[PDB]
Coordinates of C-alpha atoms and ligand atoms in Angstrom, one line a residue:
Chain F
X1 CA 26.9 -46.3 -46.9
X2 CA 27.4 -47.5 -50.5
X3 CA 24.0 -49.1 -51.3
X4 CA 22.2 -46.0 -52.6
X5 CA 25.0 -44.2 -54.4
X6 CA 24.3 -46.0 -57.7
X7 CA 20.5 -45.4 -57.4
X8 CA 21.1 -41.7 -56.6
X9 CA 23.4 -41.2 -59.6
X10 CA 20.9 -42.7 -62.0
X11 CA 18.2 -40.5 -60.4
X12 CA 20.2 -37.3 -60.6
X13 CA 21.0 -38.2 -64.2
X14 CA 17.2 -38.6 -64.9
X15 CA 16.5 -35.4 -62.9
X16 CA 19.1 -33.1 -64.5
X17 CA 17.2 -33.5 -67.9
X18 CA 14.0 -32.4 -66.2
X19 CA 15.3 -29.5 -64.2
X20 CA 17.3 -28.1 -67.2
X21 CA 16.9 -24.6 -68.7
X22 CA 16.1 -24.0 -72.4
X23 CA 19.5 -24.0 -74.4
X24 CA 18.8 -20.9 -76.5
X25 CA 16.7 -18.7 -74.2
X26 CA 19.0 -15.6 -74.1
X27 CA 18.3 -14.9 -77.8
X28 CA 14.6 -14.9 -76.9
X29 CA 15.2 -12.4 -74.1
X30 CA 15.0 -9.0 -75.8
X31 CA 16.6 -6.9 -73.1
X32 CA 19.3 -9.1 -71.5
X33 CA 22.6 -10.3 -73.0
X34 CA 24.9 -13.1 -71.9
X35 CA 27.2 -10.4 -70.5
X36 CA 24.5 -9.1 -68.1
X37 CA 24.0 -12.6 -66.7
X38 CA 27.8 -13.1 -66.4
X39 CA 27.8 -9.9 -64.3
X40 CA 25.0 -11.2 -62.1
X41 CA 26.4 -14.7 -61.5
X42 CA 29.8 -13.2 -60.5
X43 CA 28.0 -10.9 -58.1
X44 CA 26.2 -13.9 -56.5
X45 CA 29.7 -15.4 -56.0
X46 CA 30.6 -12.3 -54.1
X47 CA 27.3 -12.6 -52.2
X48 CA 28.1 -16.3 -51.4
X49 CA 31.5 -15.3 -49.9
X50 CA 30.1 -12.4 -48.0
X51 CA 27.6 -14.7 -46.2
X52 CA 29.8 -17.8 -46.1
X53 CA 27.3 -19.9 -48.0
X54 CA 27.9 -23.4 -49.4
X55 CA 28.9 -23.4 -53.1
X56 CA 25.9 -25.7 -53.7
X57 CA 23.7 -22.6 -52.8
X58 CA 25.3 -20.7 -55.7
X59 CA 24.9 -23.6 -58.1
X60 CA 21.2 -23.9 -57.3
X61 CA 20.7 -20.2 -57.4
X62 CA 22.1 -20.2 -61.0
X63 CA 19.7 -23.0 -62.0
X64 CA 16.7 -21.1 -60.6
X65 CA 17.8 -17.9 -62.5
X66 CA 18.3 -19.8 -65.7
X67 CA 14.9 -21.7 -65.7
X68 CA 13.2 -18.5 -64.6
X69 CA 14.6 -16.6 -67.6
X70 CA 13.8 -19.6 -69.8
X71 CA 10.1 -18.7 -69.7
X72 CA 9.7 -15.1 -68.3
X73 CA 10.6 -12.0 -70.2
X74 CA 12.6 -9.9 -67.8
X75 CA 13.8 -6.3 -68.1
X76 CA 17.4 -5.5 -67.2
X77 CA 16.6 -3.3 -64.2
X78 CA 14.7 -6.2 -62.7
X79 CA 17.3 -8.9 -63.4
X80 CA 19.0 -8.4 -60.0
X81 CA 15.6 -8.8 -58.2
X82 CA 15.4 -12.1 -60.0
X83 CA 19.0 -13.0 -59.0
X84 CA 18.3 -12.0 -55.4
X85 CA 15.1 -13.9 -54.9
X86 CA 16.8 -17.0 -56.4
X87 CA 19.7 -16.7 -54.0
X88 CA 17.2 -16.4 -51.1
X89 CA 15.3 -19.6 -52.2
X90 CA 18.6 -21.5 -52.8
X91 CA 19.7 -20.3 -49.3
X92 CA 16.4 -21.5 -47.7
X93 CA 16.6 -24.8 -49.5
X94 CA 20.3 -25.5 -48.9
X95 CA 21.9 -23.6 -46.0
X96 CA 21.5 -24.7 -42.3
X97 CA 20.7 -21.2 -41.0
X98 CA 19.8 -19.0 -44.1
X99 CA 20.4 -15.2 -44.1
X100 CA 17.6 -12.8 -43.2
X101 CA 15.6 -11.3 -46.0
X102 CA 16.5 -7.8 -44.7
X103 CA 20.0 -8.8 -45.7
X104 CA 19.2 -9.9 -49.3
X105 CA 17.6 -6.4 -49.4
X106 CA 20.8 -4.9 -48.1
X107 CA 23.2 -6.3 -50.7
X108 CA 21.3 -4.8 -53.6
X109 CA 22.2 -1.3 -52.3
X110 CA 18.5 -1.1 -51.4
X111 CA 17.5 -1.0 -55.1
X112 CA 14.5 -3.0 -54.1
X113 CA 12.2 -2.8 -51.1
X114 CA 11.8 -5.8 -48.6
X115 CA 8.3 -6.2 -50.0
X116 CA 9.7 -6.4 -53.5
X117 CA 12.1 -9.2 -52.8
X118 CA 9.4 -11.3 -51.0
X119 CA 7.0 -10.9 -53.9
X120 CA 9.7 -12.0 -56.3
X121 CA 10.3 -15.1 -54.1
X122 CA 6.7 -16.1 -54.4
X123 CA 6.8 -15.5 -58.2
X124 CA 10.0 -17.5 -58.7
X125 CA 8.3 -20.4 -56.8
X126 CA 5.3 -20.1 -59.1
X127 CA 7.3 -20.2 -62.3
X128 CA 9.6 -23.0 -61.1
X129 CA 6.4 -24.9 -60.0
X130 CA 8.1 -25.4 -56.6
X131 CA 10.7 -27.8 -58.1
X132 CA 13.8 -26.6 -56.3
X133 CA 15.7 -29.9 -55.7
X134 CA 17.9 -29.5 -58.8
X135 CA 21.0 -31.5 -59.7
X136 CA 24.1 -29.3 -59.9
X137 CA 27.6 -29.6 -61.3
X138 CA 28.5 -29.7 -57.6
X139 CA 26.2 -32.6 -56.8
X140 CA 27.8 -34.5 -59.7
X141 CA 31.4 -33.8 -58.6
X142 CA 30.5 -35.1 -55.2
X143 CA 29.5 -38.4 -56.7
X144 CA 32.7 -38.5 -58.9
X145 CA 35.0 -37.8 -56.0
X146 CA 34.1 -41.2 -54.4
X147 CA 35.8 -42.8 -57.5
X148 CA 39.2 -41.2 -56.7
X149 CA 42.1 -43.4 -55.7
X150 CA 42.9 -41.9 -53.2
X151 CA 41.2 -38.6 -52.4
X152 CA 43.1 -35.5 -53.6
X153 CA 41.9 -32.1 -52.5
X154 CA 43.8 -30.1 -55.0
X155 CA 42.0 -32.1 -57.7
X156 CA 38.6 -31.6 -56.0
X157 CA 39.3 -27.9 -55.3
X158 CA 40.3 -27.4 -59.0
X159 CA 37.2 -29.3 -60.3
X160 CA 35.0 -27.1 -58.0
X161 CA 36.7 -24.0 -59.4
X162 CA 36.5 -25.2 -63.0
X163 CA 32.8 -26.1 -62.6
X164 CA 32.1 -22.8 -60.8
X165 CA 33.7 -20.9 -63.7
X166 CA 31.2 -22.6 -66.0
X167 CA 28.3 -20.9 -64.3
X168 CA 29.4 -17.4 -65.4
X169 CA 29.4 -17.9 -69.1
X170 CA 26.0 -18.9 -70.4
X171 CA 27.9 -19.2 -73.7
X172 CA 28.9 -22.1 -74.1
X173 CA 27.9 -23.8 -70.9
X174 CA 24.1 -24.0 -71.3
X175 CA 24.8 -26.5 -74.2
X176 CA 25.8 -29.1 -71.6
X177 CA 24.1 -31.0 -68.8
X178 CA 25.6 -30.6 -65.3
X179 CA 26.7 -34.2 -65.3
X180 CA 28.8 -33.5 -68.5
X181 CA 30.3 -30.2 -67.3
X182 CA 31.2 -32.0 -64.0
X183 CA 32.8 -34.9 -66.0
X184 CA 34.8 -32.4 -68.1
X185 CA 35.6 -30.5 -64.9
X186 CA 36.8 -33.6 -63.1
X187 CA 39.2 -35.0 -65.8
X188 CA 40.6 -31.5 -66.5
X189 CA 41.3 -31.0 -62.8
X190 CA 42.8 -34.5 -62.4
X191 CA 44.9 -34.2 -65.5
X192 CA 46.3 -30.8 -64.3
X193 CA 47.1 -32.0 -60.8
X194 CA 48.1 -35.7 -61.1
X195 CA 48.4 -36.3 -64.9
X196 CA 45.9 -39.2 -64.9
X197 CA 42.6 -39.3 -66.8
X198 CA 38.9 -39.9 -66.7
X199 CA 39.0 -43.3 -64.8
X200 CA 37.6 -46.5 -66.2
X201 CA 35.2 -46.9 -63.3
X202 CA 33.6 -43.5 -63.9
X203 CA 33.2 -44.3 -67.6
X204 CA 31.2 -47.4 -66.5
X205 CA 29.2 -45.4 -63.9
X206 CA 28.4 -42.4 -66.2
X207 CA 28.4 -44.1 -69.6
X208 CA 30.5 -41.2 -70.7
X209 CA 33.6 -42.1 -72.7
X210 CA 36.4 -39.5 -72.6
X211 CA 35.8 -39.0 -76.3
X212 CA 32.1 -38.2 -75.6
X213 CA 33.3 -35.5 -73.1
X214 CA 35.7 -34.0 -75.7
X215 CA 33.4 -31.2 -77.0
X216 CA 32.6 -29.8 -73.5
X217 CA 36.1 -30.6 -72.3
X218 CA 37.4 -28.4 -75.2
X219 CA 35.4 -25.4 -74.1
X220 CA 36.2 -25.8 -70.5
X221 CA 40.0 -26.0 -71.2
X222 CA 39.6 -22.6 -73.0
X223 CA 37.7 -21.0 -70.1
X224 CA 40.5 -22.2 -67.8
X225 CA 43.1 -20.7 -70.1
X226 CA 41.5 -17.3 -70.5
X227 CA 40.4 -17.2 -66.8
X228 CA 42.7 -14.3 -65.8
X229 CA 41.5 -12.1 -68.7
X230 CA 37.8 -12.7 -68.1
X231 CA 35.7 -9.6 -67.2
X232 CA 34.3 -11.5 -64.2
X233 CA 37.0 -12.3 -61.6
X234 CA 35.2 -13.2 -58.3
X235 CA 35.7 -17.0 -58.6
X236 CA 39.4 -16.7 -59.3
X237 CA 39.7 -14.5 -56.3
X238 CA 37.6 -16.9 -54.2
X239 CA 39.8 -19.9 -55.3
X240 CA 43.1 -18.1 -54.7
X241 CA 42.5 -18.9 -51.0
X242 CA 44.6 -21.4 -49.1
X243 CA 41.4 -23.2 -48.2
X244 CA 40.8 -24.1 -51.8
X245 CA 44.5 -25.0 -52.2
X246 CA 45.1 -21.9 -54.3
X247 CA 44.0 -23.9 -57.4
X248 CA 43.3 -20.7 -59.5
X249 CA 47.0 -20.0 -59.6
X250 CA 47.9 -23.4 -61.1
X251 CA 48.8 -23.0 -64.8
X252 CA 46.5 -24.8 -67.2
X253 CA 48.2 -27.3 -69.6
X254 CA 48.5 -25.8 -73.1
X255 CA 47.2 -28.9 -74.9
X256 CA 44.9 -31.7 -73.7
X257 CA 46.4 -34.5 -76.0
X258 CA 42.9 -35.5 -77.1
Chain W
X1 CA -9.1 -22.4 -51.6
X2 CA -12.8 -22.0 -51.7
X3 CA -13.5 -25.5 -52.9
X4 CA -12.5 -26.9 -49.5
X5 CA -14.5 -27.5 -46.4
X6 CA -12.7 -27.7 -43.1
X7 CA -13.9 -30.5 -41.0
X8 CA -11.8 -30.5 -37.8
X9 CA -8.2 -30.0 -36.4
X10 CA -6.5 -33.4 -36.6
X11 CA -2.9 -32.3 -36.0
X12 CA -0.8 -29.8 -34.1
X13 CA 2.9 -28.7 -34.4
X14 CA 5.3 -25.8 -34.8
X15 CA 5.4 -26.3 -38.6
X16 CA 1.7 -25.4 -38.7
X17 CA -1.9 -26.5 -38.0
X18 CA -3.3 -29.6 -39.8
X19 CA -7.0 -29.8 -40.6
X20 CA -9.1 -32.7 -42.0
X21 CA -11.0 -31.2 -45.0
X22 CA -13.4 -32.2 -47.7
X23 CA -13.3 -31.4 -51.4
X24 CA -16.8 -29.9 -52.0
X25 CA -16.7 -30.8 -55.7
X26 CA -15.1 -34.2 -56.0
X27 CA -15.9 -35.4 -52.4
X28 CA -12.2 -36.4 -51.8
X29 CA -11.2 -36.2 -48.1
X30 CA -7.8 -34.5 -47.4
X31 CA -5.5 -33.2 -44.8
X32 CA -4.8 -29.5 -45.2
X33 CA -1.5 -28.1 -43.8
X34 CA -1.8 -24.3 -43.0
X35 CA 1.1 -21.9 -42.8
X36 CA 0.6 -18.2 -42.0
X37 CA 2.6 -15.5 -43.9
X38 CA 7.5 -12.3 -42.0
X39 CA 10.5 -14.0 -43.6
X40 CA 8.8 -15.0 -46.9
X41 CA 8.0 -18.7 -47.5
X42 CA 9.4 -20.8 -44.5
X43 CA 12.4 -22.9 -45.4
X44 CA 10.7 -26.0 -43.9
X45 CA 7.8 -25.5 -46.3
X46 CA 10.1 -25.0 -49.2
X47 CA 11.9 -28.3 -48.6
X48 CA 8.7 -30.2 -47.7
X49 CA 7.0 -29.4 -51.0
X50 CA 9.8 -29.6 -53.5
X51 CA 10.9 -33.0 -52.0
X52 CA 7.5 -34.7 -51.6
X53 CA 6.8 -33.7 -55.3
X54 CA 9.6 -36.1 -56.3
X55 CA 8.6 -38.9 -54.0
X56 CA 5.6 -40.7 -55.3
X57 CA 5.4 -43.9 -53.2
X58 CA 2.7 -45.9 -51.3
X59 CA 4.6 -45.5 -48.0
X60 CA 5.3 -41.7 -48.3
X61 CA 2.4 -39.3 -47.8
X62 CA 1.0 -38.0 -51.1
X63 CA 1.2 -34.2 -51.4
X64 CA -1.8 -33.6 -53.7
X65 CA -1.8 -29.9 -54.2
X66 CA -0.1 -26.7 -53.1
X67 CA -2.3 -23.7 -53.0
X68 CA -0.5 -20.4 -52.6
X69 CA -2.3 -17.1 -51.9
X70 CA -0.7 -13.7 -50.9
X71 CA -1.3 -14.0 -47.1
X72 CA -1.7 -17.8 -46.8
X73 CA -0.1 -21.1 -48.0
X74 CA -1.9 -24.5 -47.8
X75 CA -0.4 -27.9 -48.4
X76 CA -3.1 -30.4 -49.5
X77 CA -2.4 -34.0 -48.5
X78 CA -4.2 -37.3 -49.0
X79 CA -6.0 -37.9 -45.7
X80 CA -4.8 -40.5 -43.2
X81 CA -6.7 -41.3 -40.0
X82 CA -4.2 -41.1 -37.1
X83 CA -0.5 -41.3 -36.4
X84 CA 1.5 -44.2 -34.9
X85 CA 2.0 -42.6 -31.6
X86 CA -1.7 -42.1 -31.0
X87 CA -2.2 -45.8 -32.0
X88 CA 0.6 -46.9 -29.7
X89 CA -0.9 -45.0 -26.8
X90 CA -4.2 -46.7 -27.5
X91 CA -2.6 -50.2 -27.8
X92 CA -1.1 -49.8 -24.3
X93 CA -3.1 -52.5 -22.6
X94 CA -3.4 -55.0 -25.4
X95 CA -0.2 -54.5 -27.3
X96 CA 0.4 -54.2 -31.1
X97 CA 0.5 -57.8 -32.5
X98 CA 3.8 -58.9 -34.0
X99 CA 2.3 -59.6 -37.4
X100 CA 1.4 -55.9 -37.6
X101 CA 4.7 -54.6 -36.1
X102 CA 6.4 -56.5 -38.9
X103 CA 4.0 -55.1 -41.5
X104 CA 4.5 -51.6 -40.3
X105 CA 8.3 -51.9 -40.1
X106 CA 8.4 -53.5 -43.5
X107 CA 6.5 -50.6 -45.1
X108 CA 8.4 -48.0 -43.1
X109 CA 11.6 -49.5 -44.5
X110 CA 10.2 -49.3 -48.0
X111 CA 9.3 -45.6 -47.6
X112 CA 12.8 -44.9 -46.3
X113 CA 14.5 -47.0 -48.9
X114 CA 12.7 -45.0 -51.7
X115 CA 13.6 -41.7 -49.9
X116 CA 17.2 -42.6 -49.6
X117 CA 17.5 -43.9 -53.2
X118 CA 16.2 -40.5 -54.3
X119 CA 18.8 -38.7 -52.2
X120 CA 16.3 -37.6 -49.5
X121 CA 17.0 -37.8 -45.7
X122 CA 14.0 -37.6 -43.5
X123 CA 16.0 -36.6 -40.4
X124 CA 13.0 -36.6 -38.1
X125 CA 11.3 -40.0 -37.9
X126 CA 9.2 -40.4 -34.8
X127 CA 5.8 -42.1 -34.2
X128 CA 4.0 -38.7 -34.8
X129 CA 5.4 -38.4 -38.3
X130 CA 4.2 -41.8 -39.3
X131 CA 0.6 -42.1 -40.5
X132 CA -1.6 -45.2 -40.5
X133 CA -5.0 -46.0 -42.1
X134 CA -7.7 -48.5 -41.2
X135 CA -6.5 -50.7 -44.0
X136 CA -3.0 -51.5 -42.9
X137 CA -0.9 -48.9 -44.5
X138 CA 1.7 -46.8 -42.7
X139 CA 3.4 -43.7 -44.4
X140 CA 6.2 -41.4 -43.8
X141 CA 5.0 -37.9 -43.0
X142 CA 6.3 -34.4 -42.1
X143 CA 9.2 -33.5 -44.4
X144 CA 9.9 -30.1 -42.9
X145 CA 13.4 -31.1 -41.7
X146 CA 14.0 -33.4 -44.6
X147 CA 17.0 -32.7 -46.8
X148 CA 18.3 -33.5 -50.2
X149 CA 21.9 -35.0 -50.1
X150 CA 23.2 -34.7 -53.7
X151 CA 25.9 -32.9 -51.6
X152 CA 26.4 -34.3 -48.1
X153 CA 24.2 -32.6 -45.5
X154 CA 26.1 -30.7 -42.7
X155 CA 24.7 -31.2 -39.2
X156 CA 23.2 -28.2 -37.4
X157 CA 25.0 -27.1 -34.2
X158 CA 21.6 -26.8 -32.4
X159 CA 19.9 -30.1 -33.4
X160 CA 16.2 -29.2 -33.6
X161 CA 15.5 -33.0 -34.2
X162 CA 13.6 -35.0 -31.5
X163 CA 15.8 -36.1 -28.6
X164 CA 14.7 -39.8 -28.0
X165 CA 15.1 -41.0 -31.6
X166 CA 18.4 -39.2 -32.2
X167 CA 21.3 -41.3 -33.5
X168 CA 24.6 -41.5 -31.5
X169 CA 26.7 -40.0 -34.3
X170 CA 24.8 -36.7 -34.0
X171 CA 24.9 -36.6 -30.2
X172 CA 28.7 -37.2 -30.4
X173 CA 28.9 -34.3 -32.8
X174 CA 29.7 -35.7 -36.3
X175 CA 30.0 -33.3 -39.2
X176 CA 27.5 -34.8 -41.6
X177 CA 24.2 -36.7 -41.6
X178 CA 23.9 -39.9 -43.6
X179 CA 21.1 -42.5 -44.2
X180 CA 22.2 -44.1 -41.0
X181 CA 20.4 -41.6 -38.8
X182 CA 17.0 -42.5 -40.4
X183 CA 17.6 -46.2 -39.8
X184 CA 18.5 -45.5 -36.1
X185 CA 15.2 -43.7 -35.6
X186 CA 13.3 -46.6 -37.1
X187 CA 15.2 -49.1 -35.0
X188 CA 14.1 -47.2 -31.9
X189 CA 10.5 -47.1 -33.2
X190 CA 10.6 -50.9 -33.9
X191 CA 11.8 -51.6 -30.4
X192 CA 9.1 -49.3 -29.1
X193 CA 6.2 -51.1 -30.8
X194 CA 7.6 -54.3 -29.3
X195 CA 8.3 -53.1 -25.7
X196 CA 5.3 -50.7 -25.4
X197 CA 7.9 -48.2 -24.0
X198 CA 10.4 -45.8 -25.4
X199 CA 13.8 -47.4 -25.9
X200 CA 15.9 -44.3 -25.2
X201 CA 13.9 -41.7 -23.4
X202 CA 16.7 -39.2 -22.5
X203 CA 16.4 -35.8 -20.7
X204 CA 19.4 -34.1 -22.2
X205 CA 21.9 -34.9 -24.9
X206 CA 24.2 -36.6 -22.3
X207 CA 21.3 -38.4 -20.7
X208 CA 20.3 -39.6 -24.2
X209 CA 23.8 -40.6 -24.9
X210 CA 24.2 -42.5 -21.6
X211 CA 20.9 -44.3 -22.1
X212 CA 22.1 -45.5 -25.4
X213 CA 25.3 -46.7 -23.7
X214 CA 23.7 -48.5 -20.7
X215 CA 21.8 -50.7 -23.2
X216 CA 24.2 -51.3 -26.2
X217 CA 27.5 -50.7 -24.3
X218 CA 29.8 -47.7 -24.5
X219 CA 31.5 -47.8 -27.9
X220 CA 35.3 -48.1 -28.2
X221 CA 37.7 -47.8 -31.2
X222 CA 37.3 -51.5 -32.0
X223 CA 33.5 -51.4 -32.3
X224 CA 33.5 -47.9 -33.8
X225 CA 36.7 -46.8 -35.5
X226 CA 37.3 -43.1 -34.8
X227 CA 34.7 -42.7 -32.0
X228 CA 37.3 -41.3 -29.6
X229 CA 38.2 -38.5 -32.0
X230 CA 34.6 -37.3 -32.4
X231 CA 34.2 -33.7 -31.2
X232 CA 31.7 -34.4 -28.4
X233 CA 33.2 -37.7 -27.1
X234 CA 34.8 -37.4 -23.7
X235 CA 37.5 -39.7 -22.1
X236 CA 35.6 -39.5 -18.8
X237 CA 32.6 -41.4 -20.3
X238 CA 31.5 -44.4 -18.3
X239 CA 32.3 -47.8 -19.8
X240 CA 28.9 -49.6 -19.7
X241 CA 28.6 -53.3 -20.9
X242 CA 26.4 -54.4 -23.8
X243 CA 23.2 -55.8 -22.5
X244 CA 21.5 -59.1 -23.7
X245 CA 19.0 -58.1 -26.4
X246 CA 16.7 -60.8 -25.0
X247 CA 16.4 -58.6 -21.9
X248 CA 16.0 -55.4 -24.0
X249 CA 13.3 -56.8 -26.4
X250 CA 11.9 -60.0 -24.6
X251 CA 9.1 -61.0 -27.0
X252 CA 11.2 -60.7 -30.2
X253 CA 12.4 -63.8 -32.1
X254 CA 16.1 -64.3 -33.0
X255 CA 15.7 -62.6 -36.4
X256 CA 13.9 -59.7 -34.8
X257 CA 16.9 -59.2 -32.5
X258 CA 19.2 -59.8 -35.4
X259 CA 17.5 -57.0 -37.3
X260 CA 17.2 -54.7 -34.4
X261 CA 20.8 -55.0 -33.4
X262 CA 21.7 -54.1 -37.0
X263 CA 19.5 -51.0 -37.2
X264 CA 21.0 -50.0 -33.9
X265 CA 24.6 -50.6 -35.1
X266 CA 27.1 -48.1 -33.7
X267 CA 29.3 -47.2 -36.7
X268 CA 27.0 -45.3 -39.2
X269 CA 29.1 -46.9 -42.0
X270 CA 28.3 -50.5 -40.9
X271 CA 24.7 -49.8 -39.8
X272 CA 22.1 -51.5 -42.0
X273 CA 20.6 -49.6 -44.9
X274 CA 16.8 -49.6 -45.5
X275 CA 17.4 -51.4 -48.8
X276 CA 19.3 -54.3 -47.0
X277 CA 16.9 -54.7 -44.1
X278 CA 14.1 -55.5 -46.5
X279 CA 16.0 -58.7 -47.5
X280 CA 16.6 -59.6 -43.8
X281 CA 15.1 -63.1 -42.8
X282 CA 12.6 -61.4 -40.3
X283 CA 10.4 -60.4 -43.3
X284 CA 10.2 -63.9 -44.9
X285 CA 6.6 -64.3 -43.6
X286 CA 5.5 -60.7 -43.8
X287 CA 1.7 -60.1 -44.2
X288 CA -0.4 -56.9 -44.2
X289 CA -2.8 -57.0 -41.2
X290 CA -5.4 -54.4 -40.4
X291 CA -5.1 -52.3 -37.2
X292 CA -8.0 -51.7 -34.8
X293 CA -8.1 -47.9 -34.7
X294 CA -10.4 -45.5 -32.7
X295 CA -12.2 -42.3 -33.7
Ligands
LIG301 C1 1.5 -34.4 -39.0 C2 2.5 -33.4 -39.4 N1 2.6 -32.9 -40.7 N2 1.8 -33.5 -41.5 N3 1.8 -33.1 -42.8 C3 0.8 -33.8 -43.4 C4 0.2 -34.6 -42.5 C5 -1.0 -35.5 -42.6 C6 -1.2 -36.1 -43.9 C7 -2.3 -36.9 -43.9 N4 -3.1 -37.2 -42.9 C8 -2.8 -36.6 -41.8 N5 -3.7 -36.8 -40.7 C9 -3.0 -37.3 -39.5 C10 -3.1 -36.5 -38.2 C11 -3.9 -37.8 -38.3 N6 -1.8 -35.7 -41.6 C12 0.8 -34.4 -41.3 C13 0.7 -34.8 -39.9

C-alpha cells in the first residue's frame, strides 16, 4: 500500500538523528582505533554469511556497536564481546528464527563464556536504553527503490554493496546520516549501471539536491575505487555472488562529472 | 521493583504472566508483565519494548517503565480493566450497541494508523490483545509479535499468529507481510462485535482458508491478480460464490458493509489502509460511549 510510505520516510528521517552515534567518538576511545573496528565489522559480515542473516541485521548490529562505543570506554580485548552481543540483539530484533546464543559463543573461538555474552547483551540494552528500532542505510535504500523506473536489481545490488562497504570505515562514514549515505549509494549505483542520476522525485521526497549529496558522494566513490585494495574484503567476497548480480566486479567510473 | 504491590493476576499467556499492581509511593495503578530469565532476553520482549517506546498514542497501551534485574524482567504498563474478548463474552445476551462498536473500531483504526505510519506492524490483532476501560477507550496491546518494517518483513514458515484472524495472503503463503494483514484482523473483529460470533473460526489452515472462501467467494485472477501463482494456492480449490454481506452481517447499515467489505478486500494491495478507513462515511456520526463492564 502507498498511504504510509511518505509518513514513514519523514519518521525514519526524524529517527535517524535520534538513533545516531557521536561523530568523533573514536578519538575519545583510548584503546581502540578505526582499524580495530573495521576488522570487527568485516568479521560480522562473515558471521552474517555463515548464519544466512538479513543484511539489515548487520546494519543494525553496526549501529548498536557505534552507539555503545559512543558512551562506554571499552578495552580492545573486550571489543568482540561488544560486537557479538550487538549481533545477537540485532538478530533477535530482525531475524525470523535467530541463532542460538551457544552459537554466538561458538563463532568467537570460545574467547568468551556463554554467561559473558548474555551479561553483555543485558549491558548493551542498558546503554542503548532499549532503543533498538534504528534506521539503517538499508531501510533508506528500500524506500528509494520504490522510486525506480522500473526496478533494476543490479542497481539495487550495487547500492546495497556500496552502502555495506560504508559500515567498515568509521572514517569517513560516521560524518553522514544513513539517509545521506543511502542517497549517495543509490545515485552512484544507478550512475554505474544505467548512467542516469539522482531522480527528480527523490530530490522532492528527501529534500536532498544532488549537489547536497556531493561531499558524501565524493567519499563513497573513493571507497568504491579502492575497494579491492582495502584490508577488509568480506563484503566484496559476499557481493561477488551471482545472487547479488556480481556487482563487486563492476568497474567504478573514474570521474563522477559533478 | 520493591515499590510495587502485586494485587492480582489479570492476564495469562505464553509471553508471560500479567499482574495488576499498585505503586506504593505514587498510588498509580499499573499492569506488570513478568518474564523469567535461558537464551538471554526473549526476542518478543526486545521487540515489544523498543517498539512501544516510540509509539505514544491514546489508542496504544502506554509502556510506563521497564525494570531489569539479573534474574527477572518486568514491563510496567498503564492499567486497563479488561480485554475486548472478555467484554464480548459478557455482552453475549444483550449485544454490543452499534454506537460503541463504531467507537471501538474508530479508535482501533487510529491506533493501527499511528502504528503503520511509524513502520510498525502489529501482526497479532485479536480481541484479547485489545484493552478497554470503563470510560470508552480501547487500546492496542501485546506487541510481542509486532515488527518494524523499514525493510519489508518476511513471513515465518510456521505462522505463530492466531488462526481465526489470519489474512488470506499469509494462508496462501505470500513472502512478505504488509499493513493489509492488520486491517484484515480488525475487519474480522469488527464483524464479530456485530454478529456476536467469530467470522472465520477455522480448524486448520485449509479450514480457515475455505471458511474465508465460502463467505467472500474463492478469489480468481480477476479479483486478485497473481493469486494462482501464490505458493500455497491449489488448482483443486473449490470455487465458492461470494455471499450477500447483508446475510453475513445482518444488522449493519450500508456504510458498515461498505467498510467491512473493504477491510476484507482480497488483494492486499487494494485492501483499505487504516488511514483511509477513518475517512469512510461510516464514522460521520462517531461518538464515544461508555461500556458496561463487570469486575
Ligand atoms: C495482555 C497481554 N499482554 N499485555 N501486555 C500488557 C497488557 C496490559 C496492559 C494494561 N492492562 C492490562 N490489563 C488487561 C488484562 C486486563 N494488560 C497486556 C494484556
